[PDB]
């Protein structure tokens, strides 16, 4: 995650095996309940897309649902594309490109680069655009795994 | 399972179909006023006659402490 | 929570996964006992109205006392925003606008409006506005709950 | 607890929840047994009295004992404030008031109260009066509970 | 449970009863005084009778300590 | 249960019983005078026939060690 140090920056720090092992536990014990969100939310603050698709690729288990996830993922990251084009001319040496869906997803972009615009004046967050995807596809799941 | 087979039993207290409504109720995502309307209807119609009898007693305007204390010897 | 840091500051930070887990814990194994009250009032010592909504959020089972204690936190405040009207005409620029019954609940404020408010000289303790709401209705239910 | 942090003065920091747990798990375990009155001194170290109260209100079980302590604890203070006559004539503006029973017992005193009169210069052990009542009604307990 | 359905059984220790009691008056929330009057009151009135006996021998101003070491080999 | 109340069984190893009475002398409250004055006294007048035999031949002075040690085939 990217988190602020005591000298008053915002730098990024490992996140740490026992939060690991709570998000497995967590699945483990209540796999599709709704309690899952929060639990979710609160283990996801000042985390990066690199840290979550870790997140959602550590999980053993559920994989209808794991595919149903990444399927609603690239059907969200494809609309961010369709909805936000790219913009006019080649990009200035002063400024830092705009993301994609797949920069959102993790994919096509590099930590320092998740760093660069999280940190950056004005920030931009990706982390919560990507935190929506999943969980409106967490809905999705919840919905259907009703029985 | 939808909220529709929430139903409760003819020897079921009225309190563990309470919970088990308000735990289904809580994977419904509908508008407020759809869920206040779901909460006077259907928690109602789907009890049973015993208690069901005793609900009708209470009138509108009741809340969930006087529901649950109301139906408890049922 | 908001805590004071070193440097002599009243800050955020976050949560610990233990003390999520030990709420959790505290709910499971003691229900509705009257220990919950004192418990829960040491957990929610600096704590934000955003920390007590996910307390409250991350609960699994006892729906129907989760619903119980849900209505009279709107009772509470609906209260709130009878007993203290809006203020007199436009906000100040040079001010922060007072908090409504819904801003208490956390539910139309923002975290950083919830820091402006308990940081900010005088302070207001919207925290321990909720809390009353919060062990007012842990009385409730464990009046009704007593068999 | 009232601890010293590292630029050398001393501030109030929360009591930790497995400290908590532990002194639940002691109380499980060893119920009035004379051990626990070393293990309630080492986990009372640089405690408030409202911790103090906090750790008295969280116990489950022993309820008589729970109230013969509590009438000790108000007998105690009782003799505190006999003793201990008010002072002459108003409070200064240049000072802070003295203590009664009650204060002693954090009933009546805040904790920047408590953090007042033990910080300030000379400090007065409220703490430390508290304590041997505690352990002056841990004696009845155990003398009683003794088979 | 409530307050008043708090009773010593015939064979019970007044102890574990004493236990039960001030279980239940701390799920009680009513003024003090009104508990001080619980206290005196309704803890004697539903004692059984061998220690019923022996608390009325005890007379007023008794303290817990005596009347827990008073009805213990009853 | 009381101090004077401690005494050792007639097949109970001493061993057994001085850990006992260390328990209960752990749980009185005397000055410590009068914890040595019950030392020396109640330990060996409560203690069965056969060691405390053994014990009147150690004599006085005697460390817990050497009682220790001395009545142990009994």
Known sequence: ?147 | TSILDIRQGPKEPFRDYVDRFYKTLRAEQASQEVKNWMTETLLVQNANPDCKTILKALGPGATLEEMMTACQGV
Do not use: C
């Open chain 1, 1 to 147: 995650p990217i988190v602020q140090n005591l000298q008053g920056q915002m730098v990024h720090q490992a996140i740490s095996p026992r939060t690991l092992n709570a998000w497995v536990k967590v699945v483990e014990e209540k796999a599709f309940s709704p309690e899952v969100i929060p639990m979710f939310s609160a283990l996801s603050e000042g985390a990066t897309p690199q840290d979550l698709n870790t997140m959602l690729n550590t999980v053993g288990g559920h994989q209808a649902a794991m595919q149903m996830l990444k399927e609603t993922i690239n059907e969200e990251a494809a609309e961010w594309d369709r909805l936000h084009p790219v913009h006019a001319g080649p990009i200035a040496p002063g400024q830092m490109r705009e993301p994609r869906g797949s920069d959102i997803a993790g994919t096509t972009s590099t930590l320092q680069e998740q760093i660069g615009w999280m940190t950056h004046n004005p920030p931009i967050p990706v982390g919560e655009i990507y935190k929506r995807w999943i969980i409106l596809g967490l809905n999705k799941i919840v919905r259907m795994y009703s029985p």
